[PDB]
Write a protein that binds this ligand. Structure first.
Ligand code: CLA
Ligand SMILES: CCCCCCCCCCCCCCCCCC(=O)OC[C@H](CO[C@@H]1O[C@H](CO)[C@H](O)[C@H](O)[C@H]1O)OC(=O)CCCCCCCCCCCCCCCCC
Ligand code: HEM
Ligand SMILES: CC1=C(/C=C/C(C)=C/C=C/C(C)=C/C=C/C=C(C)/C=C/C=C(C)/C=C/C2=C(C)CCCC2(C)C)C(C)(C)CCC1
Ligand SMILES: CC1=C(/C=C/C(C)=C/C=C/C(C)=C/C=C/C=C(C)/C=C/C=C(C)/C=C/C2=C(C)CCCC2(C)C)C(C)(C)CCC1
Ligand SMILES: CCCCCCCS[C@@H]1O[C@H](CO)[C@@H](O)[C@H](O)[C@H]1O
Ligand SMILES: CCCCCCCS[C@@H]1O[C@H](CO)[C@@H](O)[C@H](O)[C@H]1O
Ligand SMILES: CCCCCCCS[C@@H]1O[C@H](CO)[C@@H](O)[C@H](O)[C@H]1O
Ligand SMILES: CCCCCCCS[C@@H]1O[C@H](CO)[C@@H](O)[C@H](O)[C@H]1O
Lengths: 56, 137, 56, 97, 244, 56
């Protein structure tokens, strides 16, 4: 289908990606809603969602 | 919704002539299809060869065309491969092979028309479910 | 609310880049499933940061 | 680096038409007259440098040759992909209904 | 008089290639005019060796013994193909079809399991020049294809695959993907193997030959997830030659 | 950091049921008296002595 992804606002503002694995990678993030950059190293984060104090 | 004459109106031949089936013919078609065909063709698929289904679009692209009463009745007498190239009576149930497919022995010309009508009407009712397999259950 | 703001920006004559760049970081962040309290697990312990990471 | 070759194949003509060098045999059912007789011959005599070369299969009847000519527009050829032709996958690729 | 399925079933004999007796030391005439073919080729492995992979390359790596854990399921048989005569009198077997592969798992000292696709797929094997007759001096040397041990549909335990399956570690929705590239992106191996067949017995009347073989090939790489190992397979073979 | 392995090796127990030996050999057969068999024997001894303690 020749799917591309363009970003508006944020870090990637003005950029367009056409590489299918890159575009797919962003689409996987888009199922979670708005896309963020995370520091996963400082806490050795495991990539698995946790609840908030509201949940607890 | 109702099983109307319009639903029961299907192509009789390759020219464009239609035939309108009765509710009795519909019932008979389902009964006879279950009797002789369903063990392999339940829900419009083909258990022993899933590549070929009983969807009207598939039948239309068969050789000779099978998307009409005449084509289907002829198939039930002298079944062929999808390209028309080989006669498969020896491995497919037919009037021609009623000796080795004994359930075909008591099927009349009237019965064949009913079964053919069932095959054509069913997708008009069930849509993509007919010939769809488990995905559509 | 994000969409409302973007549409209003566009209606007022902003480009798509300007419209999205006017969305506050904090508002975008609420529109992300990682902050939904119904996404955790009983034995997935600790801060939300321990899962997806510290948002940057 | 690391690429899924089947996904990449989907970005070529293989994703648009029946690829005579790669596509599983059940795909020939999409068009009149191709399955099973011609489909078997096409897969058996692969690969082809061009689509037209399908007309060179030994033993074809004149009707069969004409059916092929009428369908050339629905065919393509790309490089043989090991992952699609190994395991007898052109004859049965593990997909039914 | 002659053994039947019920004589053989469950004995282990069905995994053994046919043998020739000690009097079979003849020679099978070759005629440059006539085309030949192998009607049946059988290969029965008797030992599997895996090359050790030391931490240091200064000392040479040796092939070591392994234990078979997949039982009497190892032999190739019913293999056929053209036996061509080449202008220099040499003969070339071009493998066409047959039961020409077996998945095999062997276990090294300390438990490490080595799965491999023991195979001669697409074998092209040649004799020495000027073979007027196949004798106990004739040998075949050649190369064959070793395709991926799993084919393209195979799904890993997390449901990832090449021609099917997920393309990511779905249990880790927000993990960084770079470190998992090798496990996430499946790849289909195709490598070369080498084989030598040493003819030890010939029945010139029947056209049957037998002897020993040695083959070398790579093991399973689990669709690109790890480096394969070098395997050496030794055993006995049997072949029947016919005019085509 | 092996503490008891050297004491088994000192008096002739050098092989594992898994097929290795501490001298670096492959495919050896240690019989029952591998490192594992020694371990097993001591566990069974422990149990027998435990029961004998109860009786006494
Ligand atoms: C109302 C109680 C309560 C709640 C909702 C929270 C909430 C929170 N705490 Mg606090 N905390 C509490 C009380 C609480 N705390 C108490 C009493 C202490 C002292 C022990 C602490 C000390 C503490 C520390 C040190 C930390 C937190 C952290 C956290 C966060 C992560 C929670 C987590 O991972 O749980 C995990 C929950 C479970 C694994 C579920 C427990 C299930 C038990 C074992 C069930 C027992 C079953 C029972 C034996 C069955 C009996 C059967 C029998 C009757 C027959 C979250 C905001 C973390 C945080 O992020 O800090 C910044 C953190 O590091 N808490
Ligand atoms: C007197 C002695 C006191 C008793 C000793 C208590 C030890 C027993 C162990 C208790 C089990 C809890 C341990 C969970 C495992 C763990 O590692 O947690 C570890 C977590 C901490 O989480 C840690 O956080 C770190 C950053 O600060 C890192 O991210 C770590 O990865 C993360 O593990 O401990 C807690 O959160 C404790 C608070 C839990 C309270 C939540 C409310 C749940 C109440 C449920 C009530 C159920 C009762 C009904 C049953 C009947
Ligand atoms: C009288 C009852 C039956 C009828 C009316 C019937 C109808 C049909 C039709 C119309 C087709 C062609 C489909 C197409 O062109 O897309 C077909 C194909 C096929 N049917 Fe039946 N069928 C009957 C019984 C059976 C039974 C009992 C079996 C299983 C034993 C069976 C197995 C098959 C197979 C394997 C094909 C594909 C044949 C080929 O092209 O090689 N059919 N059938
Ligand atoms: C945590 C840790 C660790 C560990 C440890 C351990 C492992 C331990 C142990 C231990 C132990 C394991 C112990 C023990 C014990 C015991 C005892 C002390 C006992 C006893 C007894 C008794 C008392 C008995 C009695 C009796 C009986 C029963 C019967 C009859 C008789 C009599 C009476 C005699 C380490 C160091 C690594 C490090 C850090 C951490
Ligand atoms: C010679 C030999 C050897 C050795 C050995 C040994 C060392 C042994 C031992 C032993 C033992 C060491 C034994 C034992 C024992 C015991 C017992 C037999 C017991 C018992 C008991 C009982 C019977 C009890 C009871 C009771 C209880 C439990 C509880 C409460 C009550 C009563 C008291 C009733 C070896 C191997 C080197 C080698 C070669 C041979
Ligand atoms: C078909 C007649 C050609 C002579 C070859 C031997 C008989 S072939 C014949 O094929 C029929 C299906 O068409 C079956 O009804 C019948 O049982 C089968 O034996
Ligand atoms: C008392 C019961 C002892 C349990 C026996 C465990 C099998 S023996 C075990 O096998 C492993 C894999 O083959 C080796 O890695 C290991 O060195 C060896 O000790
Ligand atoms: C409590 C479990 C008992 C296990 C007994 C297994 C013995 S095994 C037996 O042992 C002999 C003497 O060591 C060896 O000569 C021989 O190679 C070995 O097979
Ligand atoms: C209580 C259960 C303990 C079972 C003991 C079984 C180990 S028995 C052990 O097996 C080795 C190969 O696995 C052989 O090399 C060796 O001869 C034999 O003694």
């Amino acid at each position: 289908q020749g799917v591309t992804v363009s970003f508006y606002g944020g870090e990637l503002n003005g950029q367009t990606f056409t590489d299918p694995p890159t575009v797919k990678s962003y689409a996987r993030k888009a199922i979670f809603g708005e896309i963020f950059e995370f520091d996963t190293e400082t806490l050795n984060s495991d990539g698995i969602f946790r609840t908030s104090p509201r949940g607890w | 919704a109702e099983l109307t004459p319009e639903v029961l109106t299907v192509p009789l031949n390759s020219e464009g002539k239609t035939i309108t089936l009765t509710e009795k013919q519909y019932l008979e078609g389902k009964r006879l299809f279950q009797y002789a065909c369903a063990s392999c063709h339940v829900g419009g698929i083909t258990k022993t060869n899933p590549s070929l289904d009983l969807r009207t679009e598939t039948l239309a692209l068969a050789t000779p065309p099978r998307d009409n009463i005449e084509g289907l009745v002829d198939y039930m007498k002298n079944p062929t491969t999808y390209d028309g190239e080989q006669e498969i009576a020896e491995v497919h149930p037919s009037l021609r092979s009623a000796d080795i497919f004994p359930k075909m022995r008591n099927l009349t010309e009237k019965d064949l028309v009913a079964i053919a009508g069932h095959i054509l009407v069913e997708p008009k009712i069930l849509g993509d479910k007919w010939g769809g397999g488990k995905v559509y259950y | 609310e994000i969409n409302r703001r973007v549409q209003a920006s566009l209606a007022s004559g902003a480009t798509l880049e300007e419209a999205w760049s006017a969305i506050p970081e904090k508002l975008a962040f609420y529109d992300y499933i990682g902050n939904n309290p119904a996404k955790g697990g009983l034995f997935r312990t600790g801060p939300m940061n321990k899962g997806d990471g510290i948002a940057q | 680096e690391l690429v899924n070759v089947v996904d990449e194949k989907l970005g070529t003509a293989y994703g648009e038409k029946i690829d005579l060098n790669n596509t599983n045999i059940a795909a020939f059912i999409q068009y009149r007259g191709l399955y099973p007789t011609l489909a078997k011959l096409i897969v058996k005599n692969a690969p082809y440098e061009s689509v037209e070369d399908v007309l060179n299969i030994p033993g074809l009847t004149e009707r069969q040759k004409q059916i092929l000519r009428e369908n050339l527009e629905h065919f393509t050829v790309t490089e043989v992909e090991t992952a699609l032709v190994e395991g007898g996958d052109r004859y049965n690729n593990g997909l039914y209904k | 008089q002659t053994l039947t399925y019920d004589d053989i079933v469950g004995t282990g004999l069905a995994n053994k290639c046919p043998t020739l007796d000690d009097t079979a030391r003849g020679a099978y005439p070759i005629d440059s005019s006539q085309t030949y073919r192998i009607a049946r080729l059988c290969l029965q492995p008797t030992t599997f060796l895996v090359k050790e992979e030391p931490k240091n390359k200064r000392q040479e790596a040796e092939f070591v013994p392994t234990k078979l854990v997949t039982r009497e399921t190892t032999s190739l048989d019913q293999i056929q193909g053209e036996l061509k005569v080449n202008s220099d009198g040499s003969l070339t077997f071009v493998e066409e079809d047959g039961i020409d592969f077996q998945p095999v798992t062997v276990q090294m000292a300390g438990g490490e399991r080595i799965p491999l696709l023991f195979t001669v797929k697409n074998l092209v094997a040649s004799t020495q020049p000027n073979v007027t007759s196949i004798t106990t001096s004739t040998d075949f040397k050649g190369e064959f294809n070793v395709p991926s041990y799993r084919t393209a549909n195979f799904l890993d335990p997390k449901g990832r695959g090449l021609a099917s399956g997920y393309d990511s570690a779905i249990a880790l929705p927000q993990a960084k993907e770079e470190e998992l590239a090798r496990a996430n992106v499946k790849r289909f191996s195709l490598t070369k193997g080498q084989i030598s067949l040493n003819v030890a017995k010939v029945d010139g009347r029947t056209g049957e030959i037998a002897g020993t073989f040695e083959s070398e090939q790579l093991s399973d790489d689990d669709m690109g997830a790890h480096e394969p190992h070098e395997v050496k397979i030794q055993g006995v073979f049997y072949a029947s030659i016919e005019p085509a | 950091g092996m503490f008891v392995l050297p004491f088994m090796a000192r008096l002739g127990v050098t092989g594992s049921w898994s097929g290795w030996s501490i001298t670096g050999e492959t495919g050896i057969d240690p019989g029952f008296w591998s490192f594992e068999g020694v371990a097993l024997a001591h566990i069974v001894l422990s149990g027998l002595l435990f029961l004998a303690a109860c009786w006494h």
